[PDB]
Amino acid sequence: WGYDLVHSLKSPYIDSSYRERAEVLVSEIKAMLNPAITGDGESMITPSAYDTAWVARVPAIDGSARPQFPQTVDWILKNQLKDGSWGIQSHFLLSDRLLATLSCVLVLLKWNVGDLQVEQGIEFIKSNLELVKDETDQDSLVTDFEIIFPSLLREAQSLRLGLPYDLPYIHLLQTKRQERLAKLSREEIYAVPSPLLYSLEGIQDIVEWERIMEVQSQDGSFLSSPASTACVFMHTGDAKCLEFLNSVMIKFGNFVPCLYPVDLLERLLIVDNIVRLGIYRHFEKEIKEALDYVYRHWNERGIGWGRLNPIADLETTALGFRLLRLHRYNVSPAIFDNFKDAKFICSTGQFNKDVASMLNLYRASQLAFPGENILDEAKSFATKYLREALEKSETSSAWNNKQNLSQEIKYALKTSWHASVPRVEAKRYCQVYRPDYARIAKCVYKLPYVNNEKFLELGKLDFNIIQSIHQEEMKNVTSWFRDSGLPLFTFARERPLEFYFLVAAGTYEPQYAKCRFLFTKVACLQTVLDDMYDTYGTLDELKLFTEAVRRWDLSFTENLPDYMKLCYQIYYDIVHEVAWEAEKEQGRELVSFFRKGWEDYLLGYYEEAEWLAAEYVPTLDEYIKNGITSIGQRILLLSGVLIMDGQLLSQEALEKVDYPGRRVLTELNSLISRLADDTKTYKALASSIECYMKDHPECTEEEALDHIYSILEPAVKELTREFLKPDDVPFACKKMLFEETRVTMVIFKDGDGFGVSKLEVKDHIKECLIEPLPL
Ligand SMILES: [Cl-]
Ligand SMILES: [Mg+2]
Ligand SMILES: [Mg+2]
Ligand SMILES: [Mg+2]
């Protein structure tokens, strides 16, 4: 550990050639995304054999005995898989292959073509249906499979195709179809758009086609489904239906996907993945362009996966809410009212979509601002949903197991956005992100703009480069520390890497080296000052030191004990080095401001020192008042935030984030740090818990701990708002303050009082700063 460990590190990723390579990757990705974000190449989605077969059914509008879109028949004839099914070869999902294959067989028969493909298709369906022994063999189900497959199979039955219609699994599907159809309000089908519009081809006996046009989408589709739209067209001859089908053929050529467009969801997924991979700083322009488009279509009724959907989609809406708010767009949690009743619903559609909607709801709820009760309700609801999902057999399907769904749900539930280490989360996501990820709707599909090899290549390389740069900084840190004189204070533990980690794990960009360095110096000094005032020094000694603090005079130290003479000299040097660097960056005088800050901090220590000597137990109000100042976070944060390369803070701007006595960023961080620290420790000078109990002699320790949390939770919401709030404060500065708070909250998470785990601390440093990602 310390000096020897860090100086043993020799990372190759520091060479400029790696950053040059990363820049090529950035350019390639910008080129790849351009059609999606700026051009007309939006909605890049794979073919749906199932939907293509429905479109292939449409007869020529000229009344001749041939398909209107003969290219779709040719596509089907040419795209059968080796095993006789149709679908995406890389991923096998039984329900997807069954549905698509039966769909293709029937249309080939309609047009009396593809005898061999038909024979092979029928064989696939028959043989695979006969492998299903019990329900747990069916695997994950494509959207509305239980509704559609029985009706498609009855079509085959009327043609007397050689299929096993009398299998128990077939009877069970019909049973499930009835169960679904029973809860259907049929009169409302025509009045209120609903998810069933996505699958009208499966409920043809139920729908009055003469009434269905009222819930048609503006583009002529029925909930963006080519199959569902083709079905309505063949029943009605509706001109807008045909226009939608034409538009998809024009876009894709000789096939159609199972959803179109996916313009909103796709843009949000691109942004989400770029952000989670930790590579967002390279794509500011593209992310803004993507979210600007989503925001244009953001409305009080929520959003669908496509901008023309006549009903909102929880998955897309919750994802949009989170990304928009995170990028400082003004959105209101009242949009979640669109997904309520009587509260929340979303337990109807296909399983993966439902789970995705709730994971997104859960994540969105953590971005709550003060007074947003709907998000508290949302969090509770989504948590309960996800814990229940873990216990469902569907979660353990072959398909879901292959994608580690249960693991993903568990990770989300144990992970608090506020108590997260940013660099570590990006590192972990690089290890989970899948370039060839397959999604489920009416069929299995992929979105190559979202899931691709380049994103991951850049993610891993960028992480390694940043880490190698930090490793070189850590050599500088440990080298400075060794010669600094701080090691002479043997009453204080040496923690330079822990303090470096505190800032570096969140403020990681290469240009902020000085910020990280000075922040680390101040934190090392403070841990000595803290031990000196609250443990090692006597009140008479500490009184002398505190007088020296007032005087700012090196000559005055002749009065101090030897160890304090040294401590004062180091303190004085660090304060003024920081001040000099701040004045250089800011272009204005800051020595007096820093000096006042240090005086207030240490006078806070002295007040505490007086309390300790007197065995005085403060009121909670007194404890918190002192603690916000003496916890030391304010002056530490100032020693980093004012020295960020290129980030100018006027007095006016600074007061928006730093102002003793006001609930601004530095004050909230101080309060959160003090109380989170207490909740985590205190059981291992009185703490906030003990103080409250002196204030309320009758109350229990349990009540006391609950009260501290009742203070913490509101503070965290305020911190989030202060961070994300639109204003003219350089965002990099707000983010540095916020991210330092997040890492602090990681250190003190799950406050039971038993103390901080040193092994967890070292493990975080290992993961973040020491061990590279394998390439
Ligand atoms: Cl996958
Ligand atoms: Mg202390
Ligand atoms: Mg202490
Ligand atoms: Mg303590």
Coordinates of C-alpha atoms and ligand atoms in Angstrom, one line a residue, residues 534 674 677-678 681-682, ligand 4:
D534 CA -10.5 15.9 19.2
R674 CA -21.7 14.9 9.6
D677 CA -20.9 9.7 9.5
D678 CA -22.8 9.5 12.8
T681 CA -20.4 5.1 13.4
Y682 CA -21.4 6.6 16.8
Ligands
MG4 MG -15.9 10.0 14.4

